[PDB]
Design an enzyme around this catalytic site. Structure first.
Site, PDB file in Angstrom:
ATOM      1  N   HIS A  23      23.084  -0.052  -2.525  1.00  0.00           N
ATOM      2  CA  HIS A  23      22.828   1.208  -1.629  1.00  0.00           C
ATOM      3  C   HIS A  23      20.986   1.262  -1.344  1.00  0.00           C
ATOM      4  O   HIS A  23      20.653   2.287  -1.008  1.00  0.00           O
ATOM      5  CB  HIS A  23      22.987   2.601  -2.132  1.00  0.00           C
ATOM      6  CG  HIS A  23      24.712   2.766  -2.359  1.00  0.00           C
ATOM      7  ND1 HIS A  23      25.216   3.634  -1.600  1.00  0.00           N
ATOM      8  CD2 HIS A  23      25.442   2.353  -3.433  1.00  0.00           C
ATOM      9  CE1 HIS A  23      26.578   3.742  -2.192  1.00  0.00           C
ATOM     10  NE2 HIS A  23      26.698   2.928  -3.187  1.00  0.00           N
ATOM     11  N   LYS A  38      17.093  16.251   4.246  1.00  0.00           N
ATOM     12  CA  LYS A  38      17.286  14.926   3.410  1.00  0.00           C
ATOM     13  C   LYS A  38      16.246  15.312   2.447  1.00  0.00           C
ATOM     14  O   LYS A  38      15.383  15.990   2.553  1.00  0.00           O
ATOM     15  CB  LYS A  38      16.954  13.623   4.236  1.00  0.00           C
ATOM     16  CG  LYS A  38      15.775  13.609   4.893  1.00  0.00           C
ATOM     17  CD  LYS A  38      15.483  12.257   5.743  1.00  0.00           C
ATOM     18  CE  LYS A  38      16.429  12.513   7.112  1.00  0.00           C
ATOM     19  NZ  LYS A  38      17.500  11.485   7.301  1.00  0.00           N
ATOM     20  N   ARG A  39      16.610  14.606   1.058  1.00  0.00           N
ATOM     21  CA  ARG A  39      15.502  14.595   0.129  1.00  0.00           C
ATOM     22  C   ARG A  39      14.210  14.305   0.746  1.00  0.00           C
ATOM     23  O   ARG A  39      14.140  13.065   1.533  1.00  0.00           O
ATOM     24  CB  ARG A  39      16.090  13.572  -0.831  1.00  0.00           C
ATOM     25  CG  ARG A  39      17.240  13.752  -1.684  1.00  0.00           C
ATOM     26  CD  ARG A  39      17.101  15.143  -2.421  1.00  0.00           C
ATOM     27  NE  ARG A  39      16.083  14.940  -3.224  1.00  0.00           N
ATOM     28  CZ  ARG A  39      16.540  14.765  -4.870  1.00  0.00           C
ATOM     29  NH1 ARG A  39      17.608  14.908  -5.369  1.00  0.00           N
ATOM     30  NH2 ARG A  39      15.518  14.635  -5.683  1.00  0.00           N
ATOM     31  N   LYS A  65      11.204   8.099   3.899  1.00  0.00           N
ATOM     32  CA  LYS A  65      11.952   8.758   4.987  1.00  0.00           C
ATOM     33  C   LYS A  65      10.893   9.564   6.195  1.00  0.00           C
ATOM     34  O   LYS A  65      11.278   9.814   7.230  1.00  0.00           O
ATOM     35  CB  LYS A  65      12.794  10.096   4.399  1.00  0.00           C
ATOM     36  CG  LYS A  65      13.836   9.702   3.894  1.00  0.00           C
ATOM     37  CD  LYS A  65      14.548  10.474   2.393  1.00  0.00           C
ATOM     38  CE  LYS A  65      15.996  10.110   1.684  1.00  0.00           C
ATOM     39  NZ  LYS A  65      17.155   9.616   2.967  1.00  0.00           N
ATOM     40  N   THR A 107      23.562   8.938   6.255  1.00  0.00           N
ATOM     41  CA  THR A 107      25.011   9.532   6.561  1.00  0.00           C
ATOM     42  C   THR A 107      24.923  10.971   6.984  1.00  0.00           C
ATOM     43  O   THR A 107      25.675  11.213   7.999  1.00  0.00           O
ATOM     44  CB  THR A 107      25.637   9.780   5.235  1.00  0.00           C
ATOM     45  OG1 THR A 107      25.142  10.462   4.285  1.00  0.00           O
ATOM     46  CG2 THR A 107      26.386   8.533   4.968  1.00  0.00           C
ATOM     47  N   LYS A 151      26.540  13.023  10.698  1.00  0.00           N
ATOM     48  CA  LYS A 151      26.717  14.452  10.813  1.00  0.00           C
ATOM     49  C   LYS A 151      26.276  14.918  12.057  1.00  0.00           C
ATOM     50  O   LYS A 151      27.103  15.838  12.627  1.00  0.00           O
ATOM     51  CB  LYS A 151      26.407  15.043   9.522  1.00  0.00           C
ATOM     52  CG  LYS A 151      26.710  14.532   8.021  1.00  0.00           C
ATOM     53  CD  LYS A 151      26.449  15.165   6.829  1.00  0.00           C
ATOM     54  CE  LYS A 151      26.435  14.481   5.691  1.00  0.00           C
ATOM     55  NZ  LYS A 151      25.401  14.979   4.531  1.00  0.00           N
TER      56      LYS A 151
HETATM   57  C1  LIG Z   1      20.214   3.228  -5.142  1.00  0.00           C
HETATM   58  C2  LIG Z   1      20.361   4.073  -4.327  1.00  0.00           C
HETATM   59  C3  LIG Z   1      20.279   5.159  -3.585  1.00  0.00           C
HETATM   60  C4  LIG Z   1      20.973   5.262  -2.327  1.00  0.00           C
HETATM   61  N1  LIG Z   1      20.959   6.456  -1.552  1.00  0.00           N
HETATM   62  C5  LIG Z   1      21.707   6.742  -0.165  1.00  0.00           C
HETATM   63  O1  LIG Z   1      23.026   6.162  -0.273  1.00  0.00           O
HETATM   64  C6  LIG Z   1      23.374   6.925   1.006  1.00  0.00           C
HETATM   65  C7  LIG Z   1      25.000   6.140   0.895  1.00  0.00           C
HETATM   66  O2  LIG Z   1      25.071   4.855   0.992  1.00  0.00           O
HETATM   67  C8  LIG Z   1      22.688   5.890   2.009  1.00  0.00           C
HETATM   68  O3  LIG Z   1      23.252   6.359   3.231  1.00  0.00           O
HETATM   69  C9  LIG Z   1      21.131   5.969   2.046  1.00  0.00           C
HETATM   70  O4  LIG Z   1      20.362   5.238   2.942  1.00  0.00           O
HETATM   71  C10 LIG Z   1      20.697   5.806   0.771  1.00  0.00           C
HETATM   72  O5  LIG Z   1      19.291   6.052   0.624  1.00  0.00           O
HETATM   73  C11 LIG Z   1      20.658   7.871  -2.328  1.00  0.00           C
HETATM   74  O6  LIG Z   1      20.900   8.859  -1.960  1.00  0.00           O
HETATM   75  N2  LIG Z   1      20.245   7.463  -3.851  1.00  0.00           N
HETATM   76  C12 LIG Z   1      20.027   6.232  -4.142  1.00  0.00           C
HETATM   77  O7  LIG Z   1      19.535   6.556  -5.425  1.00  0.00           O
END
Ligand SMILES: C#Cc1cn([C@@H]2O[C@H](CO)[C@@H](O)[C@H](O)[C@H]2O)c(=O)[nH]c1=O
Ligand SMILES: C#Cc1cn([C@@H]2O[C@H](CO)[C@@H](O)[C@H](O)[C@H]2O)c(=O)[nH]c1=O
Lengths: 810, 810
Positions: B351, B542-543, B548, B650, B654
């Site tokens: 991810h 978002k975080r 970002k 994601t 939404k």
């Molecule tokens: C490794 C890793 C991580 C990935 N993502 C998110 O994981 C989401 C679901 O795949 C993605 O949409 C997004 O781009 C991505 O930043 C997180 O929110 N935290 C993580 O620690």
């Protein structure tokens, strides 16, 4: 099946079955293919709990409309045991549940054995609080018990290689169906901080805050539709607590540790900080809840008319300066009026004269933890000592004896002196114990305020301690005299007209024999242990403590064994000597006594020459649910504390009610029991309190007894030379040393009279019919020892309220 | 009231009312005179929960008879939010509950707001696991999510003086009606110890034991009567733990700390011991439960036919050597066969490509904590590197790049390399992210085993993220095309025939305006904040993380403000710029960005010359339940990560589904979204991945942009000289320094194209009818981004099982 177990109505039974199935599905989320006996226990508990709730809501609504005086019983201990069968008993549901579960293909007794004891107490002081709650509810009093919800209660005791091992009593692991959390009534409690004096008076600031969250448990009266509340406090950190971010979250445990674990010392004070926090926590949360409930009924003159607070020993003695703190600092009453209110509200029950059991807290502890309460305590002290000075002018020694502050090594606060000063009533718990308080440790206070001092002899509830644990006996009794004795235990006197009745004699003895077989079999099933159920069941069950003299019992057992080995082919009345009870983890002498008992069993139980004429069994993990099984099975009850040391005892009452005869000293309630049944129907031996005093003036020399009693010298040499410990010949030298050189409890002094009194017991046991007639005379005069009698005297003589036997509507 | 909310049948409504009253009385032990809105919430939750249970028991019974392949989704995070409304939605109970509660005189929406979020996740990776569970249940797969029941989830964020403060998220304080404890399925997990080699193979001994106790939460499919299980592990000490007696009981906290708190870093690895314990704990408990369930179906050849395990990133990567440990050490399979089984069972989802987010554990940690797993990992490594050597003979550099063991300062284990070696499938989460993995960080692995590598573009569930949070929109959609799109989101394409339909245009815009008013009012009620609901709602939620580029958004806001101050009497399209999200507690730059945002609002929101043409609002405590409110209210969705850094995103999906237009870079899933809707219907700007690479080869020099763009230089001088921080002129010098000298994310490089792209958004907003038609074209092509599409491709292409839309019987 049996009549005191109530009706099994067609409608009721059908309803129970459907509610049971409903909880199995919706509450437990299980079906019959996968449900274990534990699931079945829970479905039955939830089903019975549903019947309490309407009565619970109605009772608390009634107290709100009527606004009666409320009674608050503050205890650090509530030794409740199991709740399921007790609740069935008081709701008259037992035969219906039995029928309902049998129809579902279940054995209700098997399900009862799954419930954990609520082990929130150590011994008799915690169990007294439990019997009292039951009696207050049965007498219709508006009564609340307040305590601490310990996450771990008294430890589970396992025996390994004959030594006690302790393991955590994780009683909440599966959930507790009886409690309801009440997070919405959560209250803050302050610790540490410092005091600021303003023009507006004192202010306690910079404190750390712990939250007290209440859990309420229902307490049903006996068939009167009354359900009172036991409210127990759990410690919770606030949410900005400290607030590594990770460490700050983990450190919330520090706050929550307050309610984690019951201190397992009984009749022995340990001056630990965490224990003091637990005492203040229960007191600070409870008094805010009381004052809140009082305001929702400005004028605190009527407080003592609407509130009584009963202190169960000195453990909640901080209630006194906490009430003053609230009234003076928060409500701005002047001191004198605040003091008047306090004294009229509080009363103190003492449960000991052992000096090691009295709480005396170091001033430096109170200074750091509770700086404002220490200031209040200094002030109480100064004004109290000004009254002593006026009454006994020039008596400087009296001033120092009576002070709340003890001078010395470390200054300490004598918590008993504080309770006496701030209470309108002080009571002991048996007539001889209350007289001893007036003549020795509180003699100075009695001279100052004679009218404060009272007696309230202890009692036990006949619901748990007869109907529940001994249905066979409650049933042959009700056949003759009806069922009213269950809440009017004096009616048992009517049984005296049955003392020569042949059918009754035989039924009384049949019930005992059945209890004995049931208990012999429980021993084999749950413990692989083998007993002769024809033997006399000689039982001593209570916490292990030197004053209780389990050691005197041991000496008697060794004498019986030596006599057999000497004249093996002589006839003796066969005995099963059972001893059980827990020792506090750092009470070394008490652990050594456990080891001695099992070491004796090791020798005695495998000597082929003894056969089954003598067996010594250590009953492991003694607790309320084990009490309920062994007590109905006992023939002889050992109540053998040195005269002047057992404040009352209550186990003694349980045995009397259940058809055992008593061998005992003239100590505690044993004196009143002998007086009720007649001394000819009790096996009394040993020094009286007077004899003990005379021996102390002269000096106790154990060597004298050893020199003059050859049977006693033989036992001592057996102990010393390794007869009971062959692989470690000196295992028991601390015990011998103590008995020989520093026995505070004079075990040797009572030895000869005790052995001879035991020969008289064995002689009577040889004659079944006269043993049973004397049994009948005990049961029949046991009425005075009901806790309903005890609580009716507190109500009338201390709390200023009238008991009531009337039903609330169903 | 609205049709997608289901039927309000007379019978059903009467039943709900009576079950509600039953739970209020018997479950909560309250009556209507004393019940608070919280009590009412609980009575409704228990009432809805009762409808799940029959379906829950029936579903688990069906899987037992049919014995399908089971899917196990292992995640350290399940970001579930609230459960009540979601459960009503999937059971078709929403209108009936609404009717029932209205008849009792209650507002059901008010009660919904009482429920705590289950905040068991940090951001998109945890929320992905939640949408996936919903989709697996809706597609009828035999699927279990396994995780940790954290006692404290993600912290609650408060803003004080414009700074983030964290406070503990005590989400269990009032109880959680949805979970069922399962103490009877408790399992041991071992830590520390040492390895012994015997003639019989290796043995892991002298370990400390922690118990894992499961709590099960039901997961309903959408109207198919399927209810799957989310099983979360809680840490418990064993009872002889250590077993001062008092200290030994208090030290049980040490064991229980494992499940105490969620680590709040997201996209950033912290190599802490406690986090590693949590990873092994979830993995060791889950695999015993899997193997147990497999045995109750000896021959492990069929294991991969009956079990799939999906790893959610590398957090549960220990599943791989733990499965080997069990198979080799406990089951005595030989290595090669064990390895074959493992690879065929496990699959890994990546991810991230951010280097700071990749887990690389120090060998010395694994050595102390998990000595046998390190030995297994060395062995996996040796055999894997023997295959690399055979395929690329002489390529010594490839050997060092591909090793699981990273050489250096401290040796570490690269957990991503371990997952790739022990899995049959590796996937990225959007087409551009999966291509980047094959070309950069996993390029060596792809060359070795091309067939392992796949793409599965992420999705969101349309139940939570349309029907639940945006019923007004789901309703005008269902009027035209019916209700089937809720579980077949591709059907939204049919809406393209409504793009010129005047009634539809107006209804789409009416729904947005209503969401905006409802949200404007929520802001005033719950936060005293004042907005113009006619303004364009420009939202970035978002975080907080530098990649970002919340900072690029800030620069745009300052440019808009400066332009107004320059030409105050000029017309501008009014905006409400809302930014929210949490910063990890020790991520200093991210906390400084929060402070900057609120400092901008302080200046902008009280400048009378601006009026209500510009407002900057920091949305506090952003979390799933806040998402559900702001997302339906948004006009413009800010998706502005530097190309190549947002693996998928994601939140972007939404917003698209809820009628906002997107301004974004060609990053993550934004590429596929633009391709679905057509690029003319998206606001794309900025460097592509190729442009970023070219700038990196040359060297990024931020000074160049500052030198050439006078609007940018002005903002920087405002930041530096204290314009946004008058009392501390140098408050923001770390931010300026970073932007000027070490910006890994090239904020300046995208600045000009971003400001110009924002002028195009404002131009379109001026023309309501063409704004809305472009909205329609987005909603109508959002179908591909349903998690049911994502999960059907995992099922077919990785797990080897067929989705199913058929109902189980009611
Ligand atoms: C490794 C890793 C991580 C990935 N993502 C998110 O994981 C989401 C679901 O795949 C993605 O949409 C997004 O781009 C991505 O930043 C997180 O929110 N935290 C993580 O620690
Ligand atoms: C102080 C004190 C204590 C008194 N008692 C018991 O309290 C019981 C109830 O009053 C008495 O029957 C018994 O004689 C007495 O030992 C206790 O069991 N523990 C104590 O710590």
């Amino acid at each position: 099946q049996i009549s005191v177990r109530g009706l099994a109505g067609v409608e009721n039974v059908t309803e129970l079955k459907k509610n049971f199935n409903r909880h199995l599905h919706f509450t437990l989320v299980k079906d019959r293919n996968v449900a274990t006996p534990r699931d079945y226990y829970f479905a039955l508990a939830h089903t019975v709990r549903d019947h309490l709730v309407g009565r619970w809501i109605r009772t608390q609504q009634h107290y709100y409309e009527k606004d009666p005086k409320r009674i608050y019983y503050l205890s650090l201990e509530f030794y409740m045991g199991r709740t399921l069968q007790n609740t069935m008993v008081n709701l008259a549901l037992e035969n219906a549940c039995d029928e309902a579960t049998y129809q579902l293909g279940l054995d209700m007794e098997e399900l009862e054995e799954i419930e954990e004891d609520a082990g929130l107490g150590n011994g008799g002081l915690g169990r007294l609080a439990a019997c009292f709650l039951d009696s207050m509810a049965t007498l219709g009093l508006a009564a609340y018990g307040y305590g601490i919800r310990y996450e771990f209660g008294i430890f589970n005791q396992k025996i390994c290689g004959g030594w006690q091992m302790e393991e955590a009593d994780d009683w909440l692991r599966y959930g507790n169906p009886w409690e309801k959390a009440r997070p919405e009534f959560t209250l803050p409690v302050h610790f540490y901080g410092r005091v600021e004096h303003t023009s507006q008076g004192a202010k306690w600031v910079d404190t750390q805050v712990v939250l007290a969250m209440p859990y309420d448990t229902p307490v049903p009266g006996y068939r009167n539709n009354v359900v009172n509340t036991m409210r127990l406090w759990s410690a919770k950190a606030p949410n900005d607590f400290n607030l590594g971010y990770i460490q700050a979250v983990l450190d919330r445990n520090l706050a929550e540790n307050i309610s984690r674990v019951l201190y397992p010392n009984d009749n022995f004070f340990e001056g630990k900080e965490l224990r003091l926090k637990q005492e203040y926590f229960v007191v600070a949360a409870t008094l805010q809840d009381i004052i809140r409930r009082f305001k929702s009924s400005t004028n605190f003159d009527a407080f003592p008319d609407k509130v009584a607070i009963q202190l169960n020993d000195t453990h909640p003695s901080l209630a006194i300066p906490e009430l003053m703190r609230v009234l003076v600092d928060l409500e701005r009453l002047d001191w004198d009026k605040a003091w008047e209110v306090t004294v009229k509200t509080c009363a103190y029950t003492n449960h000991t004269v052992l000096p090691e059991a009295l709480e005396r807290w170091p001033v430096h502890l109170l200074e750091t933890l509770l700086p404002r309460h220490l200031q209040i305590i200094y002030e109480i002290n100064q004004r109290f000592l000004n009254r002593v000075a006026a009454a006994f002018p020039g008596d400087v020694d009296r001033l120092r004896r009576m002070s709340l502050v003890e001078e010395g090594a470390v200054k300490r606060i004598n918590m008993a002196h504080l309770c006496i000063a701030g209470s309108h009533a002080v009571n002991g718990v048996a007539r001889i114990h209350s007289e001893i308080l007036k003549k020795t440790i509180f003699k100075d206070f009695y001279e100052l305020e004679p009218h404060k001092f009272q007696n309230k002899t202890n009692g036990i509830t006949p619901r748990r301690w007869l109907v529940l644990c001994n249905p066979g006996l409650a049933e042959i009794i009700a056949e003759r005299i009806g069922e009213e004795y269950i809440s009017d235990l004096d009616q048992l006197r009517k049984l005296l007209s049955y003392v020569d009745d042949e059918a009754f004699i035989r039924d009384v003895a049949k019930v005992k024999q059945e209890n004995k077989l049931k208990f012999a079999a429980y021993l084999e099933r749950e413990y692989k242990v083998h007993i002769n159920p024809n033997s006399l069941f000689d039982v001593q069950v209570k916490r292990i403590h030197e004053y209780k003299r389990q050691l005197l019992n041991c000496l008697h057992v060794i004498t019986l064994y030596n006599r057999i080995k000497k004249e093996p082919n002589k006839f003796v009345v066969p005995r099963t000597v059972m001893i059980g009870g827990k020792a506090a983890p750092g009470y070394h002498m008490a652990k050594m006594i456990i080891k001695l008992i099992t070491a004796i069993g090791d020798v005695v139980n495998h000597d082929p020459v003894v056969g089954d004429r003598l067996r010594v069994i250590f009953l492991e993990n003694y607790r309320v649910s084990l009490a309920e099984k062994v007590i109905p099975a006992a023939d002889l009850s050992e109540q053998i504390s040195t005269a002047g040391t057992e404040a009352s005892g209550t186990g003694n009452m349980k045995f009397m009610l259940n058809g055992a005869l008593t061998i005992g000293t003239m100590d505690g309630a044993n004196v009143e029991m002998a007086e009720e049944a007649g001394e000819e129907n009790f096996f009394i031996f040993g020094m009286r309190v007077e004899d003990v005093d005379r021996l102390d003036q002269r000096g106790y020399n154990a060597q004298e007894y050893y020199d003059r009693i050859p049977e006693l010298r033989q036992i001592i040499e057996q102990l010393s030379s390794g007869f009971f410990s062959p692989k470690q010949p000196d295992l028991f030298k601390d015990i011998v040393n103590m008995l020989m050189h520093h026995d505070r409890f004079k075990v040797f002094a009572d030895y000869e009279e005790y052995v001879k009194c035991q020969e008289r017991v064995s002689a009577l046991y040889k004659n079944p019919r006269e043993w049973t007639r004397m049994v009948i005379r005990n049961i029949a005069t046991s009425g005075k020892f009901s806790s309903d009698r005890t609580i009716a005297q507190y109500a009338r003589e201390i709390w200023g309220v009238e008991p009531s036997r009337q039903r609330l509507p169903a």
